[PDB]
Scaffold this active site. Structure first.
Site, short mmCIF file in Angstrom:
data_model
loop_
_atom_site.label_atom_id
_atom_site.label_comp_id
_atom_site.label_asym_id
_atom_site.label_seq_id
_atom_site.Cartn_x
_atom_site.Cartn_y
_atom_site.Cartn_z
N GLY A 249 0.85 -1.19 0.00
CA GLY A 249 0.00 0.00 0.00
C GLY A 249 0.89 1.24 0.00
N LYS A 250 0.32 2.40 -0.37
CA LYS A 250 0.99 3.71 -0.39
C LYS A 250 -0.08 4.78 -0.42
CE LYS A 250 5.64 4.15 -1.19
NZ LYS A 250 6.48 4.00 0.04
N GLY A 251 0.31 5.96 0.02
CA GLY A 251 -0.61 7.09 0.01
C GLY A 251 0.20 8.30 -0.36
#
Ligand SMILES: CC(C)C[C@H](N)C(=O)O
Ligand SMILES: CC(C)C[C@H](N)C(=O)O
Ligand SMILES: CC(C)C[C@H](N)C(=O)O
Ligand SMILES: CC(C)C[C@H](N)C(=O)O
Lengths: 212, 422, 416, 417, 416
Positions: free
Chosen positions: A113-115
């Site tokens: 995941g990443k934001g």
């Protein structure tokens, strides 16, 4: 049946393409697992959120934020959050892809995941920077959790931002959840050994090779 | 605060929505600073939807669920299955639901979904597994007080049943009101087939009163004879107005003595269209527009009323049954000829009014008779028209513009009262 | 084809048997069939209770959820030493049908505890009831499985269920159970609806076959909540109530009884004023109307030969044996089935729940209307489905119920 | 009688206790019920930190009391006022239990408040305070646990922030957690002008019942907030002469009748009446037929009651009229209408807002009016009925009615856990 | 500047006095000071219990969460006639500090019920404890508010808290309370941790400042689980326990008591085998070490003048007041404060929680070793800090706590 490349990026040709190509170069070596490769070229989930903030001057600015879950098979999504004026959806997808890879390569029980928030933090007051992190943290609340998705620092974020995320979440949920993010200050459930880990790691793996 | 970078410069239908927001700012008063919020969807969820195909291979489909705005209540809007479904498109459509939901006065924000698929390429079993997986994927958004999907392009009672079942089994509770457009057996509403046509009448009749126009003995022209068109027809007929002309994609029939809608309908069901209807005379397609009538109901394709035909329209009132049947240039022309255009946003809102009734009834699975449905239908559309009429007079603007003003005002007032939090 | 109850198969077998007969006359798809022939789940609970003397006693309880295709499970709670898993299944399946007949958005459920409620202190019974509902909280709720009154379980039992659920869950939730006292979101009123409903159905059916209800004679078998109500309303509706009966025998008067005065003596002493009749002589009395308002298996094939009623109204579930029904229909009697004449309490519960959820209560006269027009609507539908099929009332109701169950089931599909 | 003792400011609680004990003598109340009635279920005190305009944190103190929930979820208004204590909140929560019960509503009693001077904060400080109060309460409130509502210093705008804060925390649109909302947010119609409309509806019924007429009766309205304004207004449209109104600063008096349009207009624009005729305490002693207590509690004490000339005294504000002054006015023959009856408009209106928010279906102004009126009438007639049954005044008949509904609900549900 | 309890401010005001002094020697942000001076939440409950005679009596109880900057709230439960809101508040704040001194990821909390536990039957007490925990279910939990033992609240009480909570929530949740029995997820170490801690702390401080401990005379004030343990361990480590005292008086043996024998007698008979000393005289004996291991307020200013000990070890919270500490420090005594000595109960509770949370239990050996490592670390940190500012032990501990609280608080910031 064919699975068409993602429609929402445009017929180009950027960081997501470089990631899928890496998936492609690996498929000859996969054996019985090969037909499944397609799934690696598909994020599970992409959440684009609006992050409104009352500025110091009392007006409201609106920032683009993202949280992407690339893959979730090995475990919950794990990946940092980037605050940069030139961050794009497809960049965050790519990075979320690489985290799926990186987490698996060392055998951590994590998906990827990443934001990202499209913002120049240099241009914000510390007070505005905080309201930004808090609002983003509320907006991706439906994703978050120590058994669901665990954010972390990245470009232009660190201990301070992780402290606000942890606080925002814990207050929002009515309990103290240190493990909802990593890279926290020791005072908040940080870990010892964060500063030297990667350098030491370089040595450990170099020595392991020397051994061979 | 710069334009949305994930659309690239390739705006399209979202910019159309955005422009319409711009056009309304002059009318917002002390709410105008808040107008920017309307140019930003609260959230967009793009999901991978993997489906095990009948042959045992796995196919992957992009799905979307967009919550455009949430100030006035939970997100509400249908889900579309189309091979040309894009992110930009769903977003624009979620925007239009916020507007429509507010103009008519429903306690809903705006939402929409889409899967990028050609349902024709899939078996009934595959469409089912598609539907169930999409509804599991958007499960973190769904709920009777969070988001309530509905039918749209290529979806209907069958898919809604599947969404309700999946949500209900996933959550361990039976929750009929997580979607609308369900079948009656599973907690749908009576009164759905005719709601939109009926509502066109209800809105035209309310307009008629404002100008001293008798409905009884009034002449009506209708374009399109599908669900909306023929429902409008019967509603007009059963209040004493005469239908004198219907236009189809098959042709135009005309009879000054009146055409009986129920009889036209048997012919349209039998022969696919209006052409060769025995109890009327054929009419050239262009002359339809210039007919001397009191009421004109465009209920078919979009842009049927244009620069090229507007000037000939003799009707006192145009009630839009279809979405966007008339162009801005035609707006300006009909404005000059003094003809009232009842805009689609309120004029065809009967469908979505009944969806809302379905949802109200689902809270306690207590169901209204059809006459109660139509009674409350009337109440909602008359109130919506009255408020659109009120703002058109106050601001000296056409009904179409007034409708967006009401909508945007109601949304922004709710945002202003609730305030910015967190 | 078909769940087998490990013991006490009786009521489930009867349900099964009716289902088999109705399949030949109704459009039902295999999948629906499969679902209807296997209860979704069967829960056996052990219920620890610290008794008055301080020693622990464990009781056994049940909750069966049959089929849930039309809506959340609805169903009663028996407190009776005869309660078994097999009995509970049968009743849960019967609810499913009865709800479908009344066109209600419920699936069917049932539950019981195997206890003689009269042999416990009210304190002990409170604990038993509270433990039952606590063990159940993760499997019940207002949109899940709604409980309700049944044998040995009255308004005070329902209150304790309610209080117990709400205190645990931590918010006040009147919708988890029906047949509550007025004070706690019950009413209005009744409790008295099962009998009322029974007469309403008999009314509309008599009016339809050309039959004197004007001063006609009634016999009521059973004097619990249901029978007491039937008798009471039968008199006020201008019928002549010649007999009432319990598990002890029958009180008889050929010109009518003073019913209010009888229920007064019965409620005072637990016994009837005089015993003119043996518990099985009641059936063969000279009256136009025989009403079955006690328990299942009240009238067998043999005893039906003695009946000279022209109308037999089955109110208690399974009050009338398959074999007694066949003979009376052959003789030409009007035989009104439980599925139709036994839905009063179910209807009232539905109405009760609607108001609870809304938390707004209708006036006594608004309930009455809504109740009355609904009974009329379902009598109409059973007859329309009967007529079209050339069927007696049971089969009509059974095929109507099956058709609705088929529709809900095929639309929802199999998932997970 | 053994009861909870508030550590601070026990006045309102003690009054409640007095009335409980008197009513105990005339209504069938079991001992367990009495125990539940005499000890609030839960009293919560909160420290509410707030970033002020300067950037300094200041901490405020707020309270939430749930008294008794036998009859349904708790309902309770929220006070923003410098005199808010735990003691008075306790007293108000219990008063809610009784009020709800008299009006036959499916609600238990609650109350809340923050010890603050609202007019002394900026709009942003006030907002942050109300939000924090709400976030702190999220796990303890909700549409079926504890339903907030307006009171002193707490606006429809404040109710909005409460609805919004809850909804944003819980991640769902939940209009039914608070009442008194703006119409736009799930609010009901026009009322709250309901407190005042209700007050007058009660007076009118009590009059048509004992064969008096109000055509041209002289009315003194003490208080001019939401409540008093509407009283004054509604009194005028029923053709009564409003001879004085009075704020906490004094009163304006015209023996022939005030133009209520003129006086309200000035007060709304400036915070003052057109002219000050009397000091505030002189307003009770005026030659009138009707005295309406529509301000705060303890408005009319034992001695100032010796000055009253009015035949009918209507207590709208909770504890507007002291027990010592009720005895005296009863002695002298006056009609005394209790708050439990005539102060029940806001609560009834709030209940109707709540009911509509349960299924998000909104009635018209006229439907709301009709349902409001019939329930007021049913409640007036029920109170009068229980009073004449046992030879009691209104207060006491009301209390009797409440206690037996509370007792029924308490006995049926029992002790658990 | 500060919350003012309306009832019983003594312990709270003592906390404010120490806080105000410590502010002058530590870096503390204003906003931190705000939080530290107003407890988050103070809650008062009414607790209905059905008494043995069937009549309902209502008890009054409390749970206060003071400050959660460093983690979930942690705090004991008092079943005692003297419990008040003000006391619970004071104890909650003391807990924030204690936990911070011990580098524990806990905020501070405390609870209690005004009751004499001896004056109830075990059934009445179990019911009272269950209603307490039931009323608190929505406000407590393994990461919200973790409860533990305190005055009048033993391991069986903890059992009942745990059970009630676990039955309510439908899950087995050991981490809701500490001080539990070994059978229920308690820890080996120990519920004699308070005493061992006191001594591990003492021995560590004497090693540092050249005080000889083998053969040093110890007086122990108090003989519950805490005092008993102090006495047993002091003897194990080769000290002479010349006196132990209860509230009736003391036992004295210039040669040093047979501790196990004296405690055998005390457990068996509920009395010391003999009574040499009046309650007053206890503090005035000729000894090296005096241990305050009983109740708050034990040693005041007057009594401090009696003390002949070189070291005074506060184990009970607020055993000696500020005034006695100033005097004894002025005389050159080593005063070991409660924040350090007897944080032993709390540290053990923490090690209990850690083990419960991942349901894996260390050997008595392994618990001991992690326990020792941590007290030696806490003594080190407190001394390093005291020395850098040239402060006495209490102030050093205070400044440490305050600095740590200020970090967690400034990093987390104000929200909502
Ligand atoms: C529901 C919204 C209009 C308001 C909400 N408090 C926000 O900041 O987004
Ligand atoms: C009959 C319905 C409850 C269908 C449901 N989806 C199931 O498979 O059980
Ligand atoms: C609501 C209350 C009257 C009843 C509940 N069982 C209690 O003990 O508190
Ligand atoms: C110190 C932290 C617990 C602060 C917390 N976020 C609050 O504002 O209350």
């Amino acid at each position: 049946m064919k699975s068409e490349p993602l429609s929402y990026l445009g017929k180009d040709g950027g960081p997501w393409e470089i990631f899928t190509e890496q998936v492609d170069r690996v498929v000859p070596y996969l054996g019985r697992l090969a037909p499944l490769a397609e799934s690696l070229k598909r994020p599970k989930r992409v959440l684009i959120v609006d992050v409104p903030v009352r500025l110091d001057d009392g007006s409201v600015a609106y920032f683009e934020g993202y949280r992407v879950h690339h893959n979730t098979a090995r475990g919950p999504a794990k990946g940092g959050v980037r605050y940069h004026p030139e961050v794009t959806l497809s960049e965050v997808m790519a990075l979320a892809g690489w985290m799926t890879i990186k987490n698996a390569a060392v055998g951590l029980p994590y998906g990827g995941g990443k934001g990202g928030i499209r913002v120049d933090p240099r241009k914000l007051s510390p007070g505005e920077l905080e309201r930004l992190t808090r609002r983003y943290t509320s907006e991706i609340g439906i994703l978050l959790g120590p058994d669901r998705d665990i954010p972390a620092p990245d470009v232009n974020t660190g201990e301070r931002e992780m402290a606000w995320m942890m606080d925002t979440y814990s207050m929002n949920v009515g309990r103290t959840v240190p493990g909802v993010v990593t890279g926290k200050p020791i005072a908040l459930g940080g870990s010892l050994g964060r500063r030297d880990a990667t350098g030491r790691g370089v040595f450990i793996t170099a020595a392991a090779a020397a051994e061979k | 605060s710069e334009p949305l970078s994930y659309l690239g410069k390739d705006g399209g239908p979202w910019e159309i929505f955005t422009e319409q927001v711009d056009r309304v700012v002059p009318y917002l008063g002390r709410l105008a600073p808040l107008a920017e919020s309307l140019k930003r969807p609260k959230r967009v969820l793009i999901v991978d939807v993997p489906v095990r195909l009948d042959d045992g291979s796995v196919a992957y489909f992009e799905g979307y669920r967009v919550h455009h705005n949430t100030a006035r209540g939970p997100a509400k809007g249908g889900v579309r299955y189309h091979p040309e479904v894009t992110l930009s498109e769903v977003m624009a459509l979620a925007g239009w639901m916020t507007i429509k939901n507010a103009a008519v006065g429903l306690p809903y924000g705006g939402g929409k979904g889409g899967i990028r698929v050609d349902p024709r390429k899939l078996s009934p079993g595959e469409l089912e597994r598609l539907t169930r997986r999409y509804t599991s994927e958007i499960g973190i958004l769904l709920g009777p007080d969070r988001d309530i999907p509905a039918p749209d392009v290529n979806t209907g009672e069958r898919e809604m049943a599947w969404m309700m079942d999946t949500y209900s089994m996933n959550v361990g509770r039976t929750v009929p009101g997580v979607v609308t457009g369900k079948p009656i057996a599973l907690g749908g509403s009576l009164g759905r087939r005719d709601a939109t046509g009926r509502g066109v009448f209800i809105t035209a009749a309310a307009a008629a009163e404002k100008i001293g126009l008798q409905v009884e003995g009034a002449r009506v022209a209708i374009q399109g004879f599908g669900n909306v068109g023929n429902a409008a027809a019967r509603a007009f007929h059963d209040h004493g107005a005469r239908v004198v002309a219907v236009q189809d994609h098959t042709g135009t029939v005309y009879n000054e003595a009146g055409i009986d809608p129920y009889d036209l309908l048997r012919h349209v069901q039998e022969f696919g269209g209006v052409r060769g209807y025995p109890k009327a005379e054929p009419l050239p397609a262009a002359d339809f527009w210039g007919l001397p009538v009191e009421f004109l109901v465009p209920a078919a394709l979009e842009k049927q009323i244009t620069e090229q035909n507007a000037w000939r329209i003799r009707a006192r009132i145009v009630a839009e049954g279809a979405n966007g049947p008339t162009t801005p240039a035609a707006d300006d022309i009909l404005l000059e000829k003094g003809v009232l255009v009842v805009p689609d946003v309120i004029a065809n809102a009967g469908g979505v009014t009944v969806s809302y009734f379905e949802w109200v009834q689902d809270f306690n699975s207590y169901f209204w008779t059809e006459e109660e449905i139509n009674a409350r239908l009337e109440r909602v559309l008359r109130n919506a028209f009255e408020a659109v009429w009120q703002v058109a007079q106050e601001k000296k603007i056409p009904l179409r513009t007034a409708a967006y003003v009401v909508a945007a005002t109601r949304v922004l007032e709710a945002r202003a009262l609730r305030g910015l939090y967190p | 084809k078909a769940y087998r109850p490990p013991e006490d198969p009786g009521l489930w077998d009867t349900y099964l048997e009716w289902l088999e007969r109705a399949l030949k006359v109704a459009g039902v798809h295999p999948t629906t069939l499969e679902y209807l022939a296997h209860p979704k789940r069967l829960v056996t609970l052990s219920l620890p209770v610290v008794m008055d003397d301080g020693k622990v006693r464990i009781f056994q309880g049940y909750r069966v959820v049959h089929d849930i295709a039309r809506g959340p499970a609805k169903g009663g709670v028996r407190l009776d030493p005869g309660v078994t898993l097999g009995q509970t299944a049968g009743l849960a399946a019967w609810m499913t049908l009865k709800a479908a007949v009344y066109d209600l958005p419920f699936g069917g459920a049932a539950g019981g505890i195997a206890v003689d409620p009269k042999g416990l202190s009210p304190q002990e019974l409170e604990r038993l009831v509270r433990r039952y509902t606590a063990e159940l909280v993760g499997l019940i709720g207002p949109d899940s499985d709604i409980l309700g009154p049944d044998l040995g379980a009255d308004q005070q039992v329902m209150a304790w269920i309610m209080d117990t659920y709400s205190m645990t869950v931590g918010s006040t939730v009147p919708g988890v159970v029906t047949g509550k006292p007025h004070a706690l979101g019950g009413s209005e009123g009744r409790d008295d609806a099962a009998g009322l409903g029974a007469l309403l159905v008999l009314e509309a059916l008599a009016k339809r076959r050309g039959l004197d209800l004007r001063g006609a004679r009634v016999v009521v078998q059973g004097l619990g909540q249901v029978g007491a109500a039937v008798a009471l309303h039968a008199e006020r509706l201008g019928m002549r109530v010649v007999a009432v009966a319990t598990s002890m025998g029958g009180m008889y008067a050929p010109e009518g009884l003073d019913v209010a005065e009888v229920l007064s003596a019965y409620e005072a002493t637990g016994s009837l004023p005089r015993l003119d009749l043996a518990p099985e002589e009641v059936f063969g009395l000279e009256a136009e109307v025989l009403v079955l308002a006690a328990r299942e298996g009240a009238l067998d094939g043999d005893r039906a030969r003695q009946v000279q009623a022209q109308a037999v109204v089955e109110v208690a579930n399974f009050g009338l044996n398959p074999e007694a029904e066949a003979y009376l229909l052959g003789k030409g009697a009007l035989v009104v089935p439980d599925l139709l004449s036994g839905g009063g309490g179910l209807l009232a519960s539905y109405l009760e729940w609607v108001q609870d959820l809304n938390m707004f209560f209708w006036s006594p006269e608004e309930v009455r209307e809504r109740f009355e027009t609904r009974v009329a609507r379902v009598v109409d539908a059973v007859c329309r489905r009967a007529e079209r099929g050339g069927l007696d009332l049971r089969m009509g109701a059974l095929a109507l119920a099956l058709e609705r169950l088929d529709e809900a089931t095929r639309l929802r599909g199999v998932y997970p």
